[PDB]
Amino acid sequence: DIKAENTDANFYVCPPPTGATVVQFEQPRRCPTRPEGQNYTEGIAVVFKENIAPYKFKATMYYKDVTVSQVWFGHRYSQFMGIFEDRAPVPFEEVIDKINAKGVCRSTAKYVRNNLETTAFHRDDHETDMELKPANAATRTSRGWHTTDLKYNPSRVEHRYGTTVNCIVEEVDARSVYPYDEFVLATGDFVYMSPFYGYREGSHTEHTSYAADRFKQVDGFYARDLTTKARATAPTTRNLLTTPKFTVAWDWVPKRPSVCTMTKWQEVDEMLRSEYGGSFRFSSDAISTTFTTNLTEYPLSRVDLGDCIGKDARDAMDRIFARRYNATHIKVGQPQYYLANGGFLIAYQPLLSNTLAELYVREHLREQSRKPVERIKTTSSIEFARLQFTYNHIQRHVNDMLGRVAIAWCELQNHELTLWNEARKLNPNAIASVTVGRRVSARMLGDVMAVSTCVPVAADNVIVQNSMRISSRPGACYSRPLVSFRYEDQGPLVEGQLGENNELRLTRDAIEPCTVGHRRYFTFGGGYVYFEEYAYSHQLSRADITTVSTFIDLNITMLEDHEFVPLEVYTRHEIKDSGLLDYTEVQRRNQLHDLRFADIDTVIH
Amino acid sequence: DIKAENTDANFYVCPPPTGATVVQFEQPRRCPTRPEGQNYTEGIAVVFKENIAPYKFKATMYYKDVTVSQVWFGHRYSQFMGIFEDRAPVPFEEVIDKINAKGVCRSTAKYVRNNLETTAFHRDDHETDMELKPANAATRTSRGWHTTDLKYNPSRVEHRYGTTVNCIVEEVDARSVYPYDEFVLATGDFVYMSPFYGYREGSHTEHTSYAADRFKQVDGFYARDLTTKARATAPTTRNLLTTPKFTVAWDWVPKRPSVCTMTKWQEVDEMLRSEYGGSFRFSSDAISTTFTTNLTEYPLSRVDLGDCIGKDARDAMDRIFARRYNATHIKVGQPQYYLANGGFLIAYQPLLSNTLAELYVREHLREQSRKPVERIKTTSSIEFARLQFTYNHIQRHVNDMLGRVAIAWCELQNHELTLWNEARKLNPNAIASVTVGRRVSARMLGDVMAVSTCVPVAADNVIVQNSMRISSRPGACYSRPLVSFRYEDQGPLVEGQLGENNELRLTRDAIEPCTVGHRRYFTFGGGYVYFEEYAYSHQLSRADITTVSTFIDLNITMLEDHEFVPLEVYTRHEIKDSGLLDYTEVQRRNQLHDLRFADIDTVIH
């Protein structure tokens, strides 16, 4: 007769549970603990890197442009038969007694060349001292001077050749590279001797490819400016090497101080040293890097030419404290040195707040414990350290915040059990069915709960009695409707009344005193049945009623994917191209010349 | 007699609480609010970088190979006494009237060299014009031409010398670098003048190291191809510089347009400008970068030679809109220019959706507000920007999703209080003990709760009466068992009955009407006691019963650690090595020659 309007649901008959099946709620579980926070040491650090810069210094070249042209005289013209150009090494004595001394040069070259002592007279006249004037102007140039301007050629009248001599002096830039046993000039000439060669200290062990009299060292030299004529106010030690083609002078200075194989790279006001995994971590918050190192300091003794390290190390460390923690913190021992992957040498100065000044004694002892010739190689890319630093910092948070939640969760559950405990006491069925993940019947046998599964009844095989007032015992009116049903389609018809959430209770025992304005709704099928004044009215669907929710919401979204495409500022080729001249490309073209423009096989007779 | 089988637990006696101790549940707390979302401006952007590429252009060299050999004649052989090679600067007039004009050269050189006007006749014959033929073949070469192939040497019959002259013309590649006041050829020769030198416009202020008649500028030049003989269809302005060793010609073109000190680097269809921390952010989603900048635009006026910037800037910006937002969006003003860390110049075109077209007026005003000679230096690494971009994007999510949860949590708690409120009303003890984190006794004094701590009773000092049926008042049967106990080992024996979770209630007041099939379980010690038909049966352990849980699970795992090792494609050395010839290495070896193979000290007599 009155069948379910909404069929998108199920019905259940839950017969009383015997001691057949009984379960117990799990007890509160043990909660995880926030990890003991990492301990960080404050400290200052300076980071050094393989020094790739060459040694630089000033030098002065003295030499002579010795030219000899030969000329054939045509009836109405002239033709060079030859033009011989050479370089004469102005000698020690002329550089001291003539040039430096008075600012003049002789007009004559006299040197060895191919094992013979040749000699050139300017214009082939008697020797004549000539004042040196600055070279002509030119953008981007060291200083320079010369005596002669033009070239002297023989007249038709006449020594069938013409000789020219131009005394030249330049303040070239010198550059040398490790091992620094030879150096180079601005002109492109090598000089096969150490820039630190000399007679003072152990400097005489330095390298040299030349005989002893080539080299000479004036001890107490006041050079005078060739433009201002001024005299040096302080003396130096002037070195003078005389090669076959020139005499080169610079100021000798002690080696060790002058150079270094590592380069101070960065200053980190707040470098943090963490201890983990049998290694150290040096996170520079500002620089966004984290260096990894053994727990053993590095022997600066093992370093080849590293005087500058501790020099700068202290300077920066002394200078930094004086500004940042001049009175904020206190040093904990002496600077220390560690070598990180990437070949970065970290000098570290462990700090300590005035707050925990009590801990000084202990700390100190654990720092001095770390205290125990070759070159260090440095990678070009610091990327891995910034990755490390980055990844670590994020991982840290993620884990931290997440951990905290895992706990907040656990605890929450433990407590909520105090709520399910009493709740099952109320509707053992509701609670039970929501614990076994299925519809069951259950009752309380003391402190445990007995259960028994329910049987699904067809949605078609359920019918609602039309009234709710008992004819037999008037003055009484049930509170829950009555129904009929069959577990099978062709099956018999069973009596019983309705219960919460489509439970077809067999025994019709629920009744209340009859009343007026007694209208109710009942969970019937996929919707509700509407009874008014203890008598049926009509059916509905859940859609007809305004919903409210018991769930706090949460809109979690995924961090979506992202592709990192190859991206580069300057490609390799751009860089190569960034050089105005290319030796290789040119050489290749230069040496092709006679192949493209001549004939290198034919033999004439 | 009947003692606890499972001893891994505790018992408690909770005596009624007086007004001595009373507490109140905390009220719902104030929840945090989702931060006002960041506002992003849509826009197009082009990124420029310090231009490191040299200026390139085509040039043509004209010069002459002037050779003079001298030969001694042996009885049965011949030996060169000398071989003098030089370069003659074909002069302006010959390049215009002979070469370019007819495709021929003279067989004679006539130039200044060492302040004398020498002259060479090919084979020392009368002057003779000679057609230029292409140079021989060679892989990877500019074009070239010449008149002569072989070298003329004197016979034993005879001017005791032989003269050769080969007119050479090459279409070399020229390259110049900022400040562009001088340039270089493909052969390796410098030319100390600006490629933009000339007589037109302000070009005459350009640089030059040569006298005025060296340089000449034909205004209206139709060059003819030396291979195809074709004549140029359009005239140019042919420059011609005549150096001591050659005459070099190229086409003068105005400077400013021709060059630039910044290089268009990338085009970003969707560049996003965010405003934060007194700076801007330019995230290129595609390129995975984020640039940081002041909120003030950059003066392109301040830029040295940046004509190309706005040139390309517009081009790309006009071209991009036309494709992407041709009708999707609308421009919001004129392109703007900002300078980011790393020295990347960002030209930006703020966009706007047709949707919010109403906001045009306001936006425009806030963009025009930003509108207000030196070179910009660019880092080689864009890594920090990709790190920035990366880190920012992840941080964003993390914070966002996490924030949302913190709230969902708060709210959840607030509501659940409506559940604890009523629950304590049920089992004030259970709820109380789970709020003070310890076992206590409590009752409800109106709206507050009175409490009093419980006393722990030894697990050994507890005993269960064997029956549950009162002899005095048969027909009645308690619902909770009875027990005995002592707070001390040597202590007296106290009477009382059992309660939920090992509570030893002193007063034995819980009783129910006697029934059949009345079996129950009771929380006794580390397990349960089993009573059947109001009479003891046996004890158990919680292990014997199937557990169900009231906790929703969560399997949170840590993001584990990871080490980023130094990783590099090409090391520094590999790069250096990538050059076929090494000037330094060679020079070093070349200049050693006379040290290894001769004797540079001995003087013969």
Next chain:
Amino acid sequence: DIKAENTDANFYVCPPPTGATVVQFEQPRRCPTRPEGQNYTEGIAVVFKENIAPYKFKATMYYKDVTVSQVWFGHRYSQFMGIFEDRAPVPFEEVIDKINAKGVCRSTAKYVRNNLETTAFHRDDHETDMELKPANAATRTSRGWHTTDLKYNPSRVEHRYGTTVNCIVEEVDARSVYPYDEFVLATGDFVYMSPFYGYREGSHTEHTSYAADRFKQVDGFYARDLTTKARATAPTTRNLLTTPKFTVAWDWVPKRPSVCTMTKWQEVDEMLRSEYGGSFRFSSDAISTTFTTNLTEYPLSRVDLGDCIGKDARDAMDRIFARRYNATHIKVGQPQYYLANGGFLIAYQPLLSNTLAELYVREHLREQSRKPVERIKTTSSIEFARLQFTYNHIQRHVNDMLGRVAIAWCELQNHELTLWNEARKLNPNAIASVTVGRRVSARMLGDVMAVSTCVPVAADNVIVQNSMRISSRPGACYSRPLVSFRYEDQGPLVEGQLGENNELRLTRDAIEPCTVGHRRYFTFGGGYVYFEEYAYSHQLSRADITTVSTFIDLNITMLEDHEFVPLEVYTRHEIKDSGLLDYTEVQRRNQLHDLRFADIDTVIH
């Protein structure tokens, strides 16, 4: 009379709800599902990169220093008129019959130069064979030998010139670059022929710029050491190219094996191949990189000179398995080759655990499915791959852990509904007011809930009756206080008693049997009212009572912002500077010489 002491709150009158308004709790929602985990293939991989290294090999130069000086004799001095230096190509026959054969050279040069067969006699004496002695010492040098030490100059007695001849032999280093059709020496001389030129195999198709008799190839050559005199134990194929200035010999070896255009870069013991988005992913956990590729293998056939690839590919792959999975896993087919963005060629060997050995047949078929002249260009930066790898790994976790929580949340809610269901049954008002987010009145009409909003009553317009014992029916004593009030300020005074949380119930129906020690607290205003023995005592504030909480706590903090500043080890300039000599800088200075020190315009007569 007795008004609220604490006014920081509100009062409400909740009149019974009719069927006017009725709502329903939302049903449990459908929960999201953990995504099907990504399937990863185990495998070994080797990564190759554009080979930028030049080809290297050893070579030997044989040539002669032919010098001719001319000397004028002064009365008391001597002057070089000229010094002509040249290089003579020791010929094939002399290198085989004299030098290599006996370790001696002739004292005479005889070669073509400028199309004439000149000849030099050492000191102009009869020919004389001379043993070659090692060159002098010099740090960092290939081997070398020579016959002569000094230079022979003419005496005043006399052929008015002096001739010198020094036979030179050096074991130079050779270098060639793709296309490898020409190579270079350590001295700086080009040799325009392929290092792989010869007569064997197809080698004769190799390049050459020289006539056929220049080149000669001895098939079966036992070179003898010029220092140890030892003879080679095994013969080679000695090549000998005779250029105009020297004869250069090396050992011919087949091309293809000798070179390669890609360079084995890294070995990845555990490379993981993921399949996604129509592409592959190759995450190297160790190297912290992830490569992206099409799902189609790459044709090694398409590779120009890649013999070495598969050579090394197998070697590493065979060598690795043998160590790691020698018996742990099993190979799944033949090595495969893919090309990733960045131009990295990935050779991959899919693996498989002995565990799932059953799946072999299927897998194999899906791998062989992927199996199907130009050079590959490689970026210099691997950063994007490490970013990819990094970002992906973090994203993975975040999403994963978060997803899990979203679920744990959903479920939690669904269940808790079983708790709100029964709770509303208890205090329909409390529960209702905490579901509509506002204070309302509600009752249960069967399975739905009827509601009706409450009316706010002024905090000023509320008053508490002083007693709680009814005079009319003594022996009885209400459980809840009584009050008076007005909805308006000037309004009438309404009777009614107090309820939970400031609800002003109109009907005074709550009463209990009178008792002693009957003290209670009541939620009155911003605090409590204290009644003792059914008679008023005093008021309080919530501050006076010790609070306990029903909320599990959670301290979520934000991951804070961080700025990644431009950071670089060596700048671009530092790198450029890292070269001891700079061809460009020098050339620029060299070619300026005659501008600064002479006069290149004046013509003398």
